[PDB]
Amino acid sequence: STTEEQAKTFLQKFDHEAEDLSYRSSLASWNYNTNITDENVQKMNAARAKWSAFYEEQSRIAKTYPLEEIQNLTLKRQLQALQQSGTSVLSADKSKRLNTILNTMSTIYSSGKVLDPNTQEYLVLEPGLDDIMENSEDYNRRLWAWEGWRAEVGKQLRPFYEEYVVLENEMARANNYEDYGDYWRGDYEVTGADGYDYSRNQLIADVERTFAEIKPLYEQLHAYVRAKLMDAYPSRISPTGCLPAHLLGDMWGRFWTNLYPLTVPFGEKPSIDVTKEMQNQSWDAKRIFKEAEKFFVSIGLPNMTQEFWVNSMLTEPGDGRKVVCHPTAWDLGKGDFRIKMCTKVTMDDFLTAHHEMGHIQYDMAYATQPFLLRNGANEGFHEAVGEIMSLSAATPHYLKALGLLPPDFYEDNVTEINFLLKQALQIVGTLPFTYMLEKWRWMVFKGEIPKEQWMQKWWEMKREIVGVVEPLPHDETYCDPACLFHVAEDYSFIRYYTRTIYQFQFHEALCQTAKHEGPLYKCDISNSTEAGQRLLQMLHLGKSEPWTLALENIVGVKTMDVKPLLNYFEPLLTWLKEQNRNSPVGWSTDWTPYSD
Amino acid sequence: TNLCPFGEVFNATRFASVYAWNRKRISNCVADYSVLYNSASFSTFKCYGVSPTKLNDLCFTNVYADSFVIRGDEVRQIAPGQTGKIADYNYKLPDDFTGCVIAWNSNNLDSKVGGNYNYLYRLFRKSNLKPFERDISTEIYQAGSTPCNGVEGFNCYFPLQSYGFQPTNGVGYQPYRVVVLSFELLHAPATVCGP
Ligand SMILES: [Zn+2]
C-alpha cells in the first residue's frame, strides 16, 4: 500500500499503546506529588521509564516513513511530532553524559544554600531567601541574599553549563539544527502551509520587532519605579542610572510585583481585596472552584467533569502527607483532568483558580484530537489561555457581580491606576527580563558570545535591554543566568514572552466580540457567550493546525502583535507620562553602584 | 419455570471481549420488558424499530442477546449506519436491524487499579466486518508488502489490542457493558411470545 496507508495504520497502533503508557506514568507522578514516599518515587521512575523508552523506539520506526509521501494535512502533523525526537541522535556515551550534567544542575539549584549572620541556618531558596527578597527593604540584607545565592549556585553551575552548551549543540547539529537555540525555536516553526509559513529565524524577527514597541512603555514604568525606589533607598540609586538587581523585589528580578508597596500610586486608597470578604460569607475551599466553574459556564465553556471533583486535591488534606502544593493542572489522559492546589482561601487563590481551571478548559477542548496532536498550537498558547481568565476575574466588575464587593462600590480613577500599575509590574515588567534572558541563551548557543565573555555580555545586555545594573562586579567564575530555575533545568524561556503577547491579542479580540464599551482593562467577558464561541474556535484546534492559523481564528492576524498590550496599558501610560515630567526617563549604562 | 434468564446474561460475573462477543439463544421466556425499561441504572437505552412503550402485543420467533465491554465513547458507534473501529471491525449492525440496545456504565466492576487488560478489541482488519459477523482469528495484520511470517514486525501488527480500564478514567474511557437484543421474524412455532 501507499505510505499514507502504511503510516495511518502505524499511527493507530501507536495511539493505543501511547494513550495507556503515558497515562500510567501520569498516574505515578500524580501519586508521588499527592503523597511523597519512598515507594512512590520508585514507581514514578519505573513507570516513566517505560513510556520514555516506548516513545523513542516508536520515533525510530516513524522515521522509516518518508514525510514527503504523505498528502494528508492531519496525518503529517502527527508524523512530524512523532519523528522529531531529541537526545536520541547522540552516542550512548554522550547521551549518558548529557543526563549526568542535566541532573547535577537540577541538584545544585535545589540544594543551594547560603550563610546567614545567624550562621547555623543554611537558608534554602524556598521557604527562605524568597521571603528575604520578596518582603524585605534592607539594602544590605538583600545584597547578601543576591550575591550569596549567585556565589554558591552560580559558581558551581558554570563548569557544568559550559559542557551543557556543547553537548546540546551536538544533539541539535546531528538533528539538522544550527544550534540548541534553534531547536527551541522549532516549536514555532511551520513549514507545510502556504501563507501560514513561520520559520525558526522569523521568531527572532518578531520577538525583536514586538519589543521595539514595549520599550517606550517600559521606559515610563522603569522611570516611575526608579523614582519611587530613590525615596525608599535614599542615596542608593542614581536618578539617571540603572536599577540595582537586588532591589527589584525578587531573587532574579523576573517580576516586579513585590515592589508594589513601595510604588503604590495612591497610598491612602487601599487595593481591591476580597480576602476578608470571602471569609465573612463562609466561602469554603471548594466554593472557589464551584464559583470559578460558573465563570467558564457563563462564557459557554463546558462544565468540569464529575470525576474531576472527586479525584482533585482541592483542599489540603489533614493527614500528614508531604504534598507538593505547587498549583498545577494535570492532563493525565484517558479523559482524566485534575488540578493540584491546596486551597488556603484568599483573593490570590481566587485569581489562580481561574488560571488553572483555564488550563483544563484548554486541555478538555482538544481531547477529541489525535493523541499526538493534543497540546497547545505552540508553547505560548497553553499558558496564555489561562491568563486571560485572570484578567477577567481580577476586574472589579466581575467581583462586584458575584457579591464580593458592596453594591454601591465606586470605581474612581485612583483605583483604576492602582490596578493597572499592579498589572504592569507583572506583565510589562517581566518582558525585558524574559527577552534579554532568552536573547542571551540564543547567542550563547549560536556562538556570538565567546566562552570568555559569558558574564560580560550577560550584564551588557541587561544594563542595555532590561535597565538593571550589577550590584557587584561579577567575573567569568559566576554564572548568574544559571541561578534561575528555568536556565538550570533545560527549560525554554521564550514561552513567557510570547505568552504575554498572546494574552492581550486574545483578550482584546474577546472583548471586541463581547461588545465592550470602554477601556480594555475594565472588560469582563463573563456572561457573554459570544466570547466563548470564538475562544473555543482556537481551543478545539490544539496542535492539529499551525499556530499562525489558530491565532487568526480568534484574533484575526497571523503575526505576533503587541498593539493590544499597549491598548490595555494605555490609560496607565498617560498617567505615567504625567508623573515622570519632573524625573529623567531612560538609564545610563556608565553608572554602577560599585564604582564609588 | 418459564422465567426468562435475563439475570444470567445481564448480571454475569464476567463479560466477554468485544471481538469475541458471546451469543446466547434463549427460549421459553416470559420477559418483563418493564423492569429493563424501568431499571433506572442503564446509561444508554436506545431502541431501534420499537417504541419505548410496552408493545407487548407483537410476538417474535426468537430473541438473541450479545454481550461485550466496549469503552464509554464507543457506545455511539453501535447503531444502524454508524462507522468506527468497533462498528466496522468488531460488531456491525445492519441498516435494517430490528431490536433494542441496552448499555450501562461498568466502572468498579470491569475496572481495577493498574488496568483490567483482559478485554480485547480488534483494531486492524483487512476489510469491514459483515453485519452480525464474528471473528476470532489472530493472524498478524499485514500493512505493507512484506511477509509477516506470523511475527510482529514492521507493518505487521497484532490485530487484537487490550483495553486499558483504570478506575480513574473519564466517562468516555470507562468500561461500558452493553447488551444488544435482536428480534427474529420467520415462520416458526414462536415459542417466545409476549404476554
Ligand atoms: Zn499555567
Short mmCIF file of N, CA, C and O in Angstrom, two decimals, chain B residues 2-3 11 19 28-29 36 38 52 56 65 67 107 137 173 189:
data_model
loop_
_atom_site.label_atom_id
_atom_site.label_comp_id
_atom_site.label_asym_id
_atom_site.label_seq_id
_atom_site.Cartn_x
_atom_site.Cartn_y
_atom_site.Cartn_z
N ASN B 2 -40.78 -20.84 33.60
CA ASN B 2 -40.77 -20.08 32.35
C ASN B 2 -40.11 -18.72 32.50
O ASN B 2 -40.20 -17.89 31.59
N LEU B 3 -39.45 -18.47 33.63
CA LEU B 3 -38.79 -17.19 33.85
C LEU B 3 -37.66 -17.01 32.84
O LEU B 3 -36.93 -17.95 32.53
N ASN B 11 -26.45 -10.00 34.29
CA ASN B 11 -25.76 -9.85 35.56
C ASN B 11 -24.68 -10.91 35.73
O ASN B 11 -24.44 -11.39 36.85
N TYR B 19 -14.52 -8.37 20.44
CA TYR B 19 -14.41 -9.20 19.24
C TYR B 19 -15.01 -10.58 19.47
O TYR B 19 -15.69 -11.12 18.59
N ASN B 28 -38.40 -19.99 25.61
CA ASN B 28 -39.40 -20.13 26.68
C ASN B 28 -39.23 -19.02 27.72
O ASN B 28 -38.97 -19.25 28.90
N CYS B 29 -39.39 -17.80 27.23
CA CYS B 29 -39.17 -16.59 28.02
C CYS B 29 -40.48 -15.83 28.20
O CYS B 29 -41.11 -15.44 27.21
N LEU B 36 -36.57 -3.99 32.61
CA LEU B 36 -35.47 -3.48 31.80
C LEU B 36 -35.68 -2.00 31.47
O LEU B 36 -34.73 -1.21 31.52
N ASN B 38 -37.58 0.11 33.23
CA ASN B 38 -37.61 0.84 34.49
C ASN B 38 -36.42 0.51 35.39
O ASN B 38 -36.51 0.70 36.61
N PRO B 52 -40.56 3.06 22.82
CA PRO B 52 -40.31 2.82 24.25
C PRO B 52 -41.52 2.28 25.00
O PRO B 52 -41.35 1.77 26.12
N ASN B 56 -46.28 -5.07 23.85
CA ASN B 56 -46.27 -6.49 24.15
C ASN B 56 -47.22 -7.30 23.28
O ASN B 56 -47.22 -8.53 23.37
N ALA B 65 -29.25 -12.28 22.38
CA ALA B 65 -28.57 -11.35 23.27
C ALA B 65 -27.07 -11.45 23.05
O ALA B 65 -26.52 -12.55 23.01
N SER B 67 -23.20 -9.88 24.29
CA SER B 67 -22.52 -9.29 25.44
C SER B 67 -21.09 -8.92 25.08
O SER B 67 -20.39 -9.68 24.40
N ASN B 107 -18.02 0.79 35.53
CA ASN B 107 -16.91 1.14 36.41
C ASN B 107 -17.12 0.50 37.78
O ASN B 107 -18.25 0.30 38.24
N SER B 137 -9.93 -14.77 14.62
CA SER B 137 -8.62 -15.06 14.07
C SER B 137 -7.56 -14.13 14.65
O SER B 137 -7.79 -12.94 14.85
N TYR B 173 -13.65 7.05 28.70
CA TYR B 173 -12.66 5.98 28.74
C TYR B 173 -12.94 4.98 29.86
O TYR B 173 -12.00 4.35 30.37
N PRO B 189 -42.87 -21.98 15.21
CA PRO B 189 -43.86 -22.04 16.30
C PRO B 189 -43.84 -20.83 17.22
O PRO B 189 -44.83 -20.60 17.93
#
